[PDB]
Amino acid sequence: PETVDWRTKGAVTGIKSQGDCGASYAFSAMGALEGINALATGKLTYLSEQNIIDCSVPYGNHGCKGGNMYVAFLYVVANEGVDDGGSYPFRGKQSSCTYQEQYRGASMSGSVQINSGSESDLEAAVANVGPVAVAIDGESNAFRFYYSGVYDSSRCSSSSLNHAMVITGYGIEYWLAKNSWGENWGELGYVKMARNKYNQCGIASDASYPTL
């Protein structure tokens, strides 16, 4: 298809704000999982980024100071589940791990990594599977203060990436990415990024999604 948006399938939750906590990895990872789960199960369940922040330090994440999607997925697989938000809510900072099995919202068996730099493989993932976790270069003041339109940056790097989000669709040529800086940033917390511009901002350098 020429354009998808996974809200069409009820596979995307509201926009979140990570506050002053540097945990996009978590928000980005949970976002893909929420989608995959909502598609399969038919019910959208909000999942807990706080769970990932508190409990994935031993898998090699840094709580509120940063981390990866991969390492968040390993935690989910090894811990055989992630709690949902309702019962494990965002506090804005690293707290004790209160992971409880009774509130396990979702589980998974692995992650598929999209071939680094390939946007046609990325589109194929997004169209045929679901929302895909990505990371980008959001260094620019233009990104930091993006408000509307298609982001099409000349200064963007395709290798050293500093911010993670969920691709929830694409259209016309852009990607539709969901950020976690709350609803007052971008287009309702969304950004439309440049599609098929030879991997601008490294959108397809480190894309993945979970299996379940």
Author numbering: 3 to 174, 179 to 218
Tell me what the authors wrote about this structure, in their words.
Silicatein is the first discovered enzymatically active multifunctional protein that catalyzes the polymerization of biogenic silica and is key to its subsequent condensation and shaping. Using a close homology to the cathepsin protein family—sequence identity between silicatein-α in T. aurantium and metazoan cathepsin L is 52%—silicatein’s mechanism of catalysis was modeled. It is suggested that, analogous to the hydrolysis of peptide bonds in the cysteine proteases by cathepsin, a catalytic triad composed of Ser, His, and Asn (a serine protease) is key to the polycondensation of silicic acid by silicatein-α. The filaments in demosponges were demonstrated to be perfect slender protein crystals, and their branching on well-defined crystallographic planes of that crystal was shown to be responsible for the high spatial regularity and symmetry of the spicules.
The tertiary structure of silicatein-α, occurring in a crystalline form in vivo, was measured in situ by serial crystallography and realized at a protein crystallography beamline at a synchrotron. In this work, a total of 3,608 individual diffraction snapshots were collected in cryogenic conditions from 90 different needle-like spicules extracted from the sponge T. aurantium. In each spicule, a rectangular beam of 30 µm × 10 µm was rastered along the axial filament to avoid measuring a previously damaged area. These data were sufficient to generate a complete dataset with a resolution of 2.4 Å. Using the known sequence of the most abundant isoform of silicatein, silicatein-α, a well-defined electron density was obtained allowing the reconstruction of a continuous protein model from Pro3 to the C-terminal residue Leu218 (except of loop Ser175 to Gln178). Surprisingly, these data reveal that the postulated active site of the protein—the catalytic triad of Ser26, His165, and Asn185—is in an inactive mode. The distance between the hydroxyl group of Ser26 and the imidazole ring of His165 is 3.6 Å, too long to allow catalytic conformation. However, in its crystalline form, in the axial filament inside the spicule, the enzymatic activity of the protein is switched off. To form the axial filament, the silicatein molecules are packed into a single slender crystal with six proteins in a single hexagonal unit cell belonging to the symmetry group P3121 with a = 5.96 nm and c = 11.63 nm. Remarkably, the modeled images obtained parallel to the c-axis and the a-axis fully agree with the experimental TEM measurements.
